[PDB]
Design a protein around this ligand. Structure first.
Ligand SMILES: O=C(O)c1cccc(C(=O)N2CCOC3(CCCC3)C2)c1
Ligand SMILES: O=C(O)c1cccc(C(=O)N2CCOC3(CCCC3)C2)c1
Ligand SMILES: O=C(O)c1cccc(C(=O)N2CCOC3(CCCC3)C2)c1
Ligand SMILES: O=C(O)c1cccc(C(=O)N2CCOC3(CCCC3)C2)c1
Ligand SMILES: O=C(O)c1cccc(C(=O)N2CCOC3(CCCC3)C2)c1
Lengths: 279, 275, 275, 280, 279
């Protein structure tokens, strides 16, 4: 029964993430789509037409988004962020909470840009993912220097309506990016390959896609609802001598575990080095 | 269009572009001049048979042309610019085709002679010779708006053409600039596979090339993801899905990623040595 | 040509062939009938919009057609033949498109009903949908000479078409039958490489597809070996030769050979289980 | 021919593999009398030195004697010795001399820098050849230095053409040539040993396997040199569909055979560059 | 000063091998092209037009080749051989020496086919290669049951004019096929790759091809003219610490030697299994 009656939400950027969050927020009932405004440099975007069908207010002018909004999501790619902050920095007011969703971009760098216009900007950095579109996102956030205690509780309230949300120290966020920020892409890759496996063994493609995704969803839910180690759940499922343990062996023989460690590492490191040359 | 075109360089790219332009009918061969440091080249004799004017003097090409293509290798561009920079006039549009060479470096060399050189950077590929090239271009500091439109009109006649930001061109080089070479390697290997399985070489080459051509045309005319088109074609339990698995087991996908990356990085690396 | 064509099967291949035939203008949609065990298929609704007649009864397709394409999966052919064999008349030409299924097995099933069935075996691919398919065919024991000419005239309108000995068709399956799937995988990976290097996905997909299309067209229009065209495009020390090296270091060539082989062998393996 | 009647005196600083190979090639071609060649070595107990003496080549421990004897002076020592050599005999280089450096990596600039401290216009040529000059099938390239006369490059080309292929290149190509034809014979000897092992594994006597493999590679190289055809086209021509040869080519591709040879050319070239960088 | 004045040579098949041998034989002066006849099922072949320019007599009818010839080369692919022997078997006479160049096909199988028509057919099996076209072929031969001692000496005389030639036991020929029969293809592959290496390091392609081929030719000639082991010649060329030994290491690290052993083995085994299903 949550609803933010006095909150105007704006999205700088009207791409995948802004659509996913707006869809999630409105599906959760916590915001009315007409109380959301999004701005985009290209109004001929599929996500822009989708946001328009929802009822979200759309504008080409970032300044209009800022003037309309209380909570302002920077739903743009990391290299776009400093241009956004140069453009609208003079329009930030006391009432604004600026929530950056861009990978790598530090609170420090945002505060430095905005503080040249107005001292004490209220900044929150988050890392979320596109499954907020089905209210199963994974979100972490860190509060900035001048964010009030109410600002982080508010943002946790809002972001918890579309998935898991928790506060973290800012120095964990690049690693979260490599795990849950990039994670859905790993899963989509795995599901495409699992479906190829089912097709190779004779399943129709549509059934193999449905079954693979359902297996992954159910297993993740089993882990989330269990107090047990993922190795224990794996043990419970592998009958001695059986089909599953034979398949687990061929995964081990290819270094399956190491590839996923490799992926989280590679995404984290790339996130860190993008900001290093930004800074 | 009364327009005169010149090529500094008379090698593979100048031949491919002149053949495509004249086949498209956007240009008559007699409105094209090319220049080369070696006039005994196979490409030079071919350009002559088509009716292109030829000269050993880069300066004559400059004085002939309105649109001047620099169709030489990247390390030769600075020599060309020092040689012909004093001859560049207001009317000229200088189109650099060299991998890696930035608009900035070209404008700097030419501005020492005349203040506002009109410079366009492109990356094309040799399939322009059959009017199926892939071309991107970026407009320079002093390029007029009609200059980029003229360029896109010309290059669209021999393939795909679009304007990009200059910072995308090195990556495009790794994808469509080097791309034909990846395809030629793949077609040779596919034919070897057909021959291993019993096909005559001539038939295996033709079938493999036709398969890649048709598949690429399907994707271009489809709104569908290439994985969806792959799914459509993989009968459960069948021959195609068995072959896809052995490609996956070799990391086929990663090798093509590796190649785009290596070409792009080498392109950037060569320009860093230039500057 | 007053000719009536039928498709047993209303899936990907029947759609692709009907779309190509009618786009070529060799056939009007109203002269084509297709039949399917499931009438709620996307391909079936598409065929309907084009103007193809549709029916759930294979027998109605047989009675409509002069040329009857069997556009079903290999394991379904024997069921089709038992269902419709009593309906095959002297006028019919039965064209099997199924991978692996031999003319011998088809003639044996149909000869139990009428003595001299006219049977043609082909292997085509779905790029017929954009009139760039690759097709081979072999004529059966009772096929008239005009039957193979009619077939080649029809299939040449939607791509490359040539007659082969039947013992080449399983290998052709591994090359051009599965080939588009290899290309779709390669194009997805090439686009990933372009995206890794900074390109937007939409542009990377377009450039990669255009590069493969143009390269394949170059090879088809060239008398030159694909290694020569590769040599022409590899500037010494440059980006392209660096990328070719990383392809070679992965055994890129061997993976494509592996794929043709695996598809061919699986095709042969499926027919051995049939017989 | 006319080179012989020119009665050129030739010197090698170095009495090793290359000096033997070039001396043997030059004398077999009849361009030089063995006794018009002089070679110097710091180690006169080498096997190549005993072979040079048997040929009738003059041997001396003093590099100065080689220089004073010579009209054309080959620097046939390992790269790291060259700067020591130029210090020692630089005062003895005369205007009549052509100095031909054979050392991998060593630039004309570094040679001219040393020699120019003595006479102002040393005539320097840089070359990269290989040991098959010994059977007059060498692969040689050369680049002419700042003060090499046009006739010096022609004389060099005439002389090195008597023992194999010879062509002028820009100097910036020579390190890559080193990785390809300079080291190339060692790649071939490795390949011939392995092909012989393969013949022996399949039941052939070693002597026959060695002879057949070497003849195969000789005939194939000659076929290509005399062909107007791409090597892939010649490969296509001899790969019968479904046959033995295409099956064997597949197992070569599966091991990345092509990439290993590219790796080798690159490694030799890169090592050649880094040896010169350590020197300078 | 060799010349076979009373010998009529015929080629069944007018492909790569028949062209290579005819070119080699005429270049060696040992045969006049007009005393050679070749037959082909497809007279629109590049090799057929080439043979016609040489002056070789061309015919579509294998029976005409047989009637014209004393020495009859079966220059056809192995699966074609039994059809040739069925076609012309009744035309073989006492005067004929039948020389099969097909991989895998045994003397025994040829003699069985021809003996149904006429007893004691004179059969020689050889394995040669296309470098006979530049008179540097590598040829082995085995004499059949009814071949006279003069027949093998004659064939050695003829085949020695276009390269190395020696008699072997028939049971070595499949292995020779994997070594020198397929060997030129290995070399063409190696030369293409070596040229790619030179191009990568900055050489023009034409120069890199010329230099690589010259290196391979010179090294093979060095080995043929030396009494020394190929490892010794390799030792003589690798200076301590130098460019060549560095390159040899990267070949060893990739298992270079094992790939060539793999190739000879694979070609030999495929040759044996082609004949096994033939027989
Ligand atoms: O061979 C296997 O790995 C396997 C895979 C799937 C199902 C089963 C099977 O037969 N099941 C009956 C009851 O117990 C099970 C749950 C834990 C293991 C067995 C499911 C076994
Ligand atoms: O570094 C490379 O490999 C590369 C890749 C793409 C383009 C170019 C480049 O600069 N080009 C201008 C001169 O003509 C060319 C046609 C083929 C070779 C050269 C294209 C070089
Ligand atoms: O075993 C396979 O993978 C395969 C490969 C090529 C062709 C066919 C085959 O029999 N076809 C008739 C039915 O429609 C098709 C279009 C795409 C799937 C089926 C082609 C199957
Ligand atoms: O199975 C193979 O790969 C193979 C290997 C060696 C020899 C032959 C063979 O039978 N030959 C008869 C005539 O033509 C040939 C030269 C070009 C291909 C065929 C030699 C076939
Ligand atoms: O670094 C290497 O491997 C290498 C490669 C090519 C040439 C040379 C070089 O400088 N040479 C001068 C005289 O001795 C040589 C013959 C045997 C080894 C050295 C050629 C060294």
């Amino acid at each position: 029964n949550l609803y933010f009656q006095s909150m105007s939400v704006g999205f700088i950027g009207a791409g995948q993430l802004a659509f996913a969050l707006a869809k999630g927020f409105t599906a959760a009932g916590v915001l009315a789509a007409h109380k959301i405004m999004a701005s985009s440099p290209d109004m001929d975007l599929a996500t822009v037409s989708a946001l328009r069908k929802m009822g979200v207010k759309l504008t080409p002018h970032n300044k209009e988004t800022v003037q309309h909004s209380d909570v302002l999501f920077l739903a743009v790619k990391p290299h776009i962020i400093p241009f956004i902050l140069d453009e609208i920095g003079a329009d930030i007011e006391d009432r604004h909470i600026v929530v950056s969703c861009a990978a790598g971009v530090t609170i420090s760098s945002i505060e430095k840009k905005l503080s040249a216009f107005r001292p004490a900007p209220r900044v929150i950095r988050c890392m979320t993912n596109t499954p907020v579109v089905v209210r199963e996102g994974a979100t972490v956030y860190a509060t900035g220097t001048h964010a009030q205690v109410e600002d982080g509780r508010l943002m946790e309230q809002l972001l918890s309506s579309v998935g898991f949300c928790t506060e973290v120290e800012e120095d964990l966020i690049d690693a979260v990016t490599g795990l849950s920020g990039s994670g859905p892409a790993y899963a989509f890759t795995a599901l495409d390959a699992l479906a190829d496996g089912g097709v190779k063994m004779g399943l129709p493609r549509r059934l193999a896609v449905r079954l693979g995704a359902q297996a992954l969803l159910g297993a993740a839910k089993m882990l989330l609802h269990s107090e047990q180690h993922p190795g224990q759940l794996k043990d419970n499922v592998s009958s001695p001598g059986g089909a599953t343990i034979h398949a687990l062996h061929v995964l081990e023989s290819g270094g399956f575990r190491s590839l996923l460690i490799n992926a989280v590492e590679a995404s984290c490191i790339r996130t860190r080095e993008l900001q290093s040359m930004a800074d």
